[PDB]
Amino acid sequence: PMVSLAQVRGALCGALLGDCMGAEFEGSDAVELPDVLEFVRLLEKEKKAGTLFYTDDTAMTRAVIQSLIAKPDFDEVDMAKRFAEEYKKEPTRGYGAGVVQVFKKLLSPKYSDVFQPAREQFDGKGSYGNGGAMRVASIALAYPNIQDVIKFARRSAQLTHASPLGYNGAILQALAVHFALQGELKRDTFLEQLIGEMERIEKLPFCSRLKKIKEFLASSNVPKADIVDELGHGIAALESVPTAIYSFLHCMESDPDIPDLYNNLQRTIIYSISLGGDTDTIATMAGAIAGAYYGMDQVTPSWKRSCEAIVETEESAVKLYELYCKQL
Ligand SMILES: CO[C@H]1O[C@H](COP(=O)(O)OP(=O)(O)OC[C@H]2O[C@@H](n3cnc4c(N)ncnc43)[C@H](O)[C@@H]2O)[C@@H](O)[C@H]1O
Ligand SMILES: [Mg+2]
Ligand SMILES: [Mg+2]
């Protein structure tokens, strides 16, 4: 049962890789698997280290981590402060057009309720973007109890994403990492775990997305086009978090298009990015799930050395592991 440092480090490094590599194709509407496979080859031969920069996905991931270390019992005010101060420090990391206002509002003295800026988004409807899920992995790595994972995924997500679609997307991504983490579950048990939890929480949309995943996994050679059409590859959590989960699950086996000299974590990241659209966020999420599942053994030296801040990430993984051991 017990989660290893290799799993915590794997998840965080998987998350970093997915963001840094996915970022190179973000928003390019026609992205082809051939471009990704050529990208990876170039990457492996780069002489200089640290050439791939992380984006807001990692900036927000680090703020989550720093809040949990400072306030292990979960302090949404501390976390809110860290999101806003990181934005203020490095505003060009690639934040969504909507979420900038929450950070600007949190930095002002006008709000005492840290959830209120998020409540105000889109004419009071709140954001359904995937920004809550892109950064949420560390909750499942820090809190062994699945209920803490659910409630803290929601509250952390709700700092910016007040639509149920946003925060239920965050809960689902946290759950996927949570269940990926405990053992090496089989595809069917993992999905059964996920379908069961989301039924309770719903996020209805996400539940039926999980059903579509079951169907797809029961087929072979499903074209990208069917996955993009049915699961999505968009900015919305509904159109990215299930897609991240599918990429992970699919790449548990050989994909005929990806050379099988790439390991599962590499395949997952490669496959994820090939879906196009919001490539940095879908890959960071799929990479977190795969990293938690397969661990650091599949985070290869040549891949990880190419990301900005890999060392700080590895360090932060050690501190997350120590805080996971404190909760046991
Ligand atoms: C560079 O890629 C970055 O954006 C990705 C997402 O990040 P985010 O979710 O943190 O940001 P935001 O909360 O701003 O929602 C993002 C955008 O979704 C749209 N939108 C959402 N709900 C909406 C709603 N109810 N009505 C109308 N429009 C809505 C808006 O166009 C909004 O501007 C991530 O991959 C990140 O790095
Ligand atoms: Mg990004
Ligand atoms: Mg993005």
Side-chain angles (χ1 to χ4, degrees), residues 1-28 30-31 33-44 46 48-75 77-106 108-109 111-122 124 126-146 148-154 156-184 187-194 196-198 200-201 204-210 212-213 216-234 236-318 320-325 327-328:
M2 201 184 69
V3 171
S4 68
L5 173 61
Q7 285 179 289
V8 170
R9 290 178 73 167
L12 285 193
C13 291
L16 179 67
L17 279 166
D19 183 55
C20 291
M21 295 175 68
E24 295 287 79
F25 299 95
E26 183 194 41
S28 186
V31 178
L33 174 65
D35 304 323
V36 181
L37 295 174
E38 191 193 333
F39 169 82
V40 158
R41 290 185 289 251
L42 277 163
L43 197 60
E44 288 172 0
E46 193 63 54
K48 207 188 265 275
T51 59
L52 301 180
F53 298 108
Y54 64 70
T55 79
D56 55 315
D57 297 55
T58 297
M60 295 200 81
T61 290
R62 211 183 312 120
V64 170
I65 294 167
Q66 283 158 19
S67 185
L68 297 179
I69 291 164
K71 298 287 182 166
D73 293 328
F74 188 82
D75 180 346
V77 171
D78 175 277
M79 191 172 290
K81 184 192 88 178
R82 289 188 202 265
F83 289 176
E85 289 192 320
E86 167 58 39
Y87 168 72
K88 183 62 204 148
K89 193 77 173 278
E90 292 191 38
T92 67
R93 275 283 181 190
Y95 291 98
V99 75
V100 165
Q101 294 310 11
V102 310
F103 300 142
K104 303 207 178 194
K105 286 176 180 188
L106 287 170
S108 85
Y111 294 82
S112 58
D113 174 7
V114 292
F115 293 98
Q116 180 58 25
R119 283 187 198 103
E120 290 177 358
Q121 290 288 87
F122 303 98
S127 171
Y128 55 53
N130 54 18
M134 79 188 173
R135 65 181 183 238
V136 80
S138 299
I139 296 301
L141 307 177
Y143 297 107
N145 292 345
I146 191 169
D148 287 345
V149 172
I150 294 166
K151 74 178 161 269
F152 298 145
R154 189 187 286 104
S156 64
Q158 282 170 328
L159 292 175
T160 60
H161 292 65
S163 160
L165 287 175
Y167 63 72
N168 286 336
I171 295 170
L172 174 53
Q173 168 59 18
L175 286 180
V177 172
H178 170 78
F179 286 115
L181 188 73
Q182 59 190 115
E184 268 187 358
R187 185 132 70 181
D188 296 278
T189 302
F190 182 99
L191 246 190
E192 282 191 339
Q193 293 278 33
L194 290 184
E197 296 303 316
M198 289 308 287
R200 230 177 297 253
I201 290 166
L204 211 70
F206 287 104
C207 287
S208 58
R209 299 283 167 117
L210 290 173
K212 279 201 274 213
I213 289 172
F216 279 139
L217 293 171
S219 310
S220 203
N221 306 316
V222 179
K224 172 200 178 171
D226 287 5
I227 296 163
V228 162
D229 283 354
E230 294 295 301
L231 300 184
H233 65 312
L238 185 56
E239 303 188 344
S240 49
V241 173
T243 305
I245 292 168
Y246 177 78
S247 299
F248 165 64
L249 291 173
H250 174 67
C251 293
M252 288 177 81
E253 314 268 310
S254 274
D255 179 299
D257 307 10
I258 303 172
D260 286 309
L261 51 79
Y262 296 111
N263 67 34
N264 299 67
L265 171 95
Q266 291 175 316
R267 175 194 308 148
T268 305
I269 289 172
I270 290 162
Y271 182 92
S272 307
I273 295 169
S274 83
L275 297 180
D278 196 356
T279 55
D280 57 349
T281 304
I282 290 169
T284 199
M285 290 185 307
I289 302 164
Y293 192 78
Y294 300 115
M296 209 58 199
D297 284 349
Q298 293 200 14
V299 175
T300 66
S302 67
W303 283 35
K304 74 180 184 179
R305 72 186 293 274
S306 66
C307 296
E308 183 188 7
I310 178 66
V311 176
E312 291 79 295
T313 296
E314 290 266 34
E315 172 171 90
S316 78
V318 181
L320 267 186
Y321 182 65
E322 295 312 281
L323 142 58
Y324 168 98
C325 292
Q327 294 285 341
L328 298 168

mmCIF file of all heavy atoms in Angstrom, residues 195-220, unseen atoms left out:
data_model
loop_
_atom_site.group_PDB
_atom_site.id
_atom_site.type_symbol
_atom_site.label_atom_id
_atom_site.label_comp_id
_atom_site.label_asym_id
_atom_site.label_seq_id
_atom_site.Cartn_x
_atom_site.Cartn_y
_atom_site.Cartn_z
ATOM 1 N N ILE A 195 -15.217 5.840 -11.574
ATOM 2 C CA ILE A 195 -16.624 5.990 -11.911
ATOM 3 C C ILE A 195 -17.443 6.050 -10.632
ATOM 4 O O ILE A 195 -18.348 6.878 -10.489
ATOM 5 C CB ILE A 195 -17.082 4.848 -12.838
ATOM 6 N N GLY A 196 -17.126 5.173 -9.684
ATOM 7 C CA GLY A 196 -17.785 5.186 -8.384
ATOM 8 C C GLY A 196 -17.739 6.506 -7.633
ATOM 9 O O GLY A 196 -18.752 6.957 -7.089
ATOM 10 N N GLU A 197 -16.553 7.121 -7.542
ATOM 11 C CA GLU A 197 -16.418 8.365 -6.777
ATOM 12 C C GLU A 197 -17.150 9.528 -7.435
ATOM 13 O O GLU A 197 -17.726 10.371 -6.742
ATOM 14 C CB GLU A 197 -14.965 8.723 -6.596
ATOM 15 C CG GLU A 197 -14.153 7.751 -5.788
ATOM 16 C CD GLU A 197 -14.672 7.489 -4.411
ATOM 17 O OE1 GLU A 197 -15.066 8.442 -3.715
ATOM 18 O OE2 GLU A 197 -14.556 6.325 -3.992
ATOM 19 N N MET A 198 -17.039 9.661 -8.754
ATOM 20 C CA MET A 198 -17.612 10.815 -9.447
ATOM 21 C C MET A 198 -19.126 10.714 -9.494
ATOM 22 O O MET A 198 -19.808 11.738 -9.605
ATOM 23 C CB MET A 198 -17.032 10.986 -10.855
ATOM 24 C CG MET A 198 -15.595 11.448 -10.921
ATOM 25 S SD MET A 198 -15.236 12.930 -9.943
ATOM 26 C CE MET A 198 -16.012 14.236 -10.896
ATOM 27 N N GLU A 199 -19.662 9.494 -9.503
ATOM 28 C CA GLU A 199 -21.111 9.330 -9.410
ATOM 29 C C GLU A 199 -21.623 10.003 -8.145
ATOM 30 O O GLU A 199 -22.585 10.777 -8.181
ATOM 31 C CB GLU A 199 -21.478 7.845 -9.421
ATOM 32 N N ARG A 200 -20.956 9.741 -7.020
ATOM 33 C CA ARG A 200 -21.327 10.347 -5.745
ATOM 34 C C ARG A 200 -21.235 11.868 -5.806
ATOM 35 O O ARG A 200 -22.158 12.572 -5.386
ATOM 36 C CB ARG A 200 -20.413 9.772 -4.667
ATOM 37 C CG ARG A 200 -21.097 9.256 -3.439
ATOM 38 C CD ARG A 200 -20.081 8.649 -2.495
ATOM 39 N NE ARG A 200 -19.487 7.523 -3.210
ATOM 40 C CZ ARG A 200 -19.732 6.245 -2.929
ATOM 41 N NH1 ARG A 200 -20.563 5.924 -1.953
ATOM 42 N NH2 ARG A 200 -19.171 5.280 -3.644
ATOM 43 N N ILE A 201 -20.140 12.392 -6.356
ATOM 44 C CA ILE A 201 -19.883 13.830 -6.304
ATOM 45 C C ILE A 201 -20.834 14.553 -7.249
ATOM 46 O O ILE A 201 -21.289 15.666 -6.973
ATOM 47 C CB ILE A 201 -18.402 14.145 -6.585
ATOM 48 C CG1 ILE A 201 -17.587 13.663 -5.393
ATOM 49 C CG2 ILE A 201 -18.204 15.641 -6.696
ATOM 50 C CD1 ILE A 201 -16.163 13.583 -5.604
ATOM 51 N N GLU A 202 -21.060 13.985 -8.418
ATOM 52 C CA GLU A 202 -21.938 14.585 -9.399
ATOM 53 C C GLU A 202 -23.376 14.302 -9.030
ATOM 54 O O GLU A 202 -23.626 13.382 -8.269
ATOM 55 C CB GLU A 202 -21.648 13.998 -10.767
ATOM 56 N N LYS A 203 -20.664 17.793 -12.873
ATOM 57 C CA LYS A 203 -19.782 16.634 -12.820
ATOM 58 C C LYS A 203 -20.441 15.365 -13.318
ATOM 59 O O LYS A 203 -19.758 14.355 -13.465
ATOM 60 C CB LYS A 203 -19.283 16.396 -11.403
ATOM 61 N N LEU A 204 -21.776 15.387 -13.488
ATOM 62 C CA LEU A 204 -22.442 14.438 -14.398
ATOM 63 C C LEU A 204 -21.650 14.337 -15.689
ATOM 64 O O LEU A 204 -21.437 13.213 -16.165
ATOM 65 C CB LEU A 204 -23.906 14.819 -14.660
ATOM 66 C CG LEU A 204 -24.670 13.532 -14.899
ATOM 67 C CD1 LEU A 204 -24.750 12.796 -13.574
ATOM 68 C CD2 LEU A 204 -26.027 13.817 -15.507
ATOM 69 N N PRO A 205 -21.279 15.445 -16.340
ATOM 70 C CA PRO A 205 -20.692 15.364 -17.675
ATOM 71 C C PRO A 205 -19.471 14.475 -17.604
ATOM 72 O O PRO A 205 -19.299 13.577 -18.431
ATOM 73 C CB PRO A 205 -20.407 16.821 -18.039
ATOM 74 C CG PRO A 205 -21.313 17.602 -17.220
ATOM 75 C CD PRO A 205 -21.480 16.857 -15.954
ATOM 76 N N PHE A 206 -18.668 14.655 -16.553
ATOM 77 C CA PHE A 206 -17.408 13.942 -16.400
ATOM 78 C C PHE A 206 -17.683 12.462 -16.218
ATOM 79 O O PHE A 206 -16.941 11.618 -16.733
ATOM 80 C CB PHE A 206 -16.722 14.401 -15.104
ATOM 81 C CG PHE A 206 -16.111 15.775 -15.136
ATOM 82 C CD1 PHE A 206 -16.747 16.826 -14.503
ATOM 83 C CD2 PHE A 206 -14.917 16.020 -15.749
ATOM 84 C CE1 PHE A 206 -16.222 18.089 -14.505
ATOM 85 C CE2 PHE A 206 -14.381 17.296 -15.734
ATOM 86 C CZ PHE A 206 -15.045 18.326 -15.118
ATOM 87 N N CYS A 207 -18.763 12.125 -15.523
ATOM 88 C CA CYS A 207 -19.097 10.722 -15.337
ATOM 89 C C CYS A 207 -19.353 10.045 -16.675
ATOM 90 O O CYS A 207 -18.852 8.943 -16.930
ATOM 91 C CB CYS A 207 -20.333 10.605 -14.448
ATOM 92 S SG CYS A 207 -19.970 10.996 -12.751
ATOM 93 N N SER A 208 -20.094 10.704 -17.564
ATOM 94 C CA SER A 208 -20.365 10.076 -18.848
ATOM 95 C C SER A 208 -19.125 10.077 -19.730
ATOM 96 O O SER A 208 -18.934 9.149 -20.518
ATOM 97 C CB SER A 208 -21.535 10.775 -19.535
ATOM 98 O OG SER A 208 -21.262 12.150 -19.718
ATOM 99 N N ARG A 209 -18.251 11.079 -19.568
ATOM 100 C CA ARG A 209 -16.932 11.032 -20.184
ATOM 101 C C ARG A 209 -16.185 9.782 -19.748
ATOM 102 O O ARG A 209 -15.548 9.115 -20.570
ATOM 103 C CB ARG A 209 -16.139 12.282 -19.812
ATOM 104 C CG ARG A 209 -16.759 13.573 -20.278
ATOM 105 C CD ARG A 209 -16.508 13.751 -21.757
ATOM 106 N NE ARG A 209 -17.333 14.800 -22.336
ATOM 107 C CZ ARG A 209 -16.859 15.915 -22.875
ATOM 108 N NH1 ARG A 209 -15.561 16.041 -23.104
ATOM 109 N NH2 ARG A 209 -17.698 16.824 -23.354
ATOM 110 N N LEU A 210 -16.227 9.460 -18.453
ATOM 111 C CA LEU A 210 -15.557 8.247 -18.002
ATOM 112 C C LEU A 210 -16.144 7.023 -18.689
ATOM 113 O O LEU A 210 -15.410 6.124 -19.120
ATOM 114 C CB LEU A 210 -15.703 8.102 -16.499
ATOM 115 C CG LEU A 210 -14.963 9.041 -15.551
ATOM 116 C CD1 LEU A 210 -15.451 8.775 -14.111
ATOM 117 C CD2 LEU A 210 -13.459 8.841 -15.673
ATOM 118 N N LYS A 211 -17.458 7.040 -18.920
ATOM 119 C CA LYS A 211 -18.093 5.940 -19.633
ATOM 120 C C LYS A 211 -17.575 5.850 -21.066
ATOM 121 O O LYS A 211 -17.224 4.763 -21.540
ATOM 122 C CB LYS A 211 -19.612 6.114 -19.589
ATOM 123 N N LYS A 212 -17.461 6.992 -21.744
ATOM 124 C CA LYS A 212 -16.921 7.000 -23.095
ATOM 125 C C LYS A 212 -15.513 6.424 -23.106
ATOM 126 O O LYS A 212 -15.112 5.760 -24.069
ATOM 127 C CB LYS A 212 -16.957 8.420 -23.649
ATOM 128 C CG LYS A 212 -18.335 8.775 -24.172
ATOM 129 C CD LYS A 212 -18.294 9.924 -25.157
ATOM 130 C CE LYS A 212 -18.340 11.277 -24.462
ATOM 131 N NZ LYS A 212 -19.060 12.290 -25.304
ATOM 132 N N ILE A 213 -14.740 6.695 -22.053
ATOM 133 C CA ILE A 213 -13.382 6.165 -21.971
ATOM 134 C C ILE A 213 -13.422 4.642 -21.925
ATOM 135 O O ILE A 213 -12.680 3.962 -22.641
ATOM 136 C CB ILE A 213 -12.661 6.727 -20.738
ATOM 137 C CG1 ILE A 213 -12.329 8.196 -20.933
ATOM 138 C CG2 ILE A 213 -11.387 5.940 -20.491
ATOM 139 C CD1 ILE A 213 -11.802 8.851 -19.680
ATOM 140 N N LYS A 214 -14.287 4.088 -21.064
ATOM 141 C CA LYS A 214 -14.486 2.642 -21.008
ATOM 142 C C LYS A 214 -14.728 2.059 -22.395
ATOM 143 O O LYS A 214 -14.128 1.043 -22.768
ATOM 144 C CB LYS A 214 -15.655 2.308 -20.068
ATOM 145 N N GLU A 215 -15.611 2.693 -23.173
ATOM 146 C CA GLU A 215 -15.919 2.197 -24.512
ATOM 147 C C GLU A 215 -14.682 2.247 -25.403
ATOM 148 O O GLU A 215 -14.347 1.266 -26.074
ATOM 149 C CB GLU A 215 -17.073 2.997 -25.123
ATOM 150 N N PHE A 216 -13.982 3.389 -25.406
ATOM 151 C CA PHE A 216 -12.807 3.553 -26.256
ATOM 152 C C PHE A 216 -11.750 2.513 -25.936
ATOM 153 O O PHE A 216 -11.146 1.929 -26.839
ATOM 154 C CB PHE A 216 -12.225 4.950 -26.092
ATOM 155 C CG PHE A 216 -12.936 6.005 -26.882
ATOM 156 C CD1 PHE A 216 -13.193 7.254 -26.333
ATOM 157 C CD2 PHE A 216 -13.304 5.769 -28.197
ATOM 158 C CE1 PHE A 216 -13.820 8.240 -27.078
ATOM 159 C CE2 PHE A 216 -13.932 6.746 -28.938
ATOM 160 C CZ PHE A 216 -14.192 7.980 -28.387
ATOM 161 N N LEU A 217 -11.543 2.239 -24.656
ATOM 162 C CA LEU A 217 -10.514 1.307 -24.236
ATOM 163 C C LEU A 217 -10.866 -0.115 -24.641
ATOM 164 O O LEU A 217 -9.972 -0.960 -24.748
ATOM 165 C CB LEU A 217 -10.396 1.367 -22.718
ATOM 166 C CG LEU A 217 -9.870 2.671 -22.121
ATOM 167 C CD1 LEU A 217 -10.020 2.635 -20.600
ATOM 168 C CD2 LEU A 217 -8.470 3.021 -22.542
ATOM 169 N N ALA A 218 -12.158 -0.395 -24.840
ATOM 170 C CA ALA A 218 -12.658 -1.675 -25.331
ATOM 171 C C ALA A 218 -12.486 -1.850 -26.834
ATOM 172 O O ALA A 218 -12.788 -2.935 -27.345
ATOM 173 C CB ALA A 218 -14.132 -1.844 -24.971
ATOM 174 N N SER A 219 -12.087 -0.800 -27.549
ATOM 175 C CA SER A 219 -11.774 -0.841 -28.972
ATOM 176 C C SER A 219 -10.264 -0.861 -29.150
ATOM 177 O O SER A 219 -9.493 -0.700 -28.200
ATOM 178 C CB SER A 219 -12.347 0.364 -29.740
ATOM 179 O OG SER A 219 -13.716 0.603 -29.489
ATOM 180 N N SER A 220 -9.841 -1.075 -30.387
ATOM 181 C CA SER A 220 -8.442 -0.884 -30.716
ATOM 182 C C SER A 220 -8.350 0.087 -31.883
ATOM 183 O O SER A 220 -9.288 0.224 -32.676
ATOM 184 C CB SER A 220 -7.760 -2.218 -31.082
ATOM 185 O OG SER A 220 -6.354 -2.156 -30.900
#
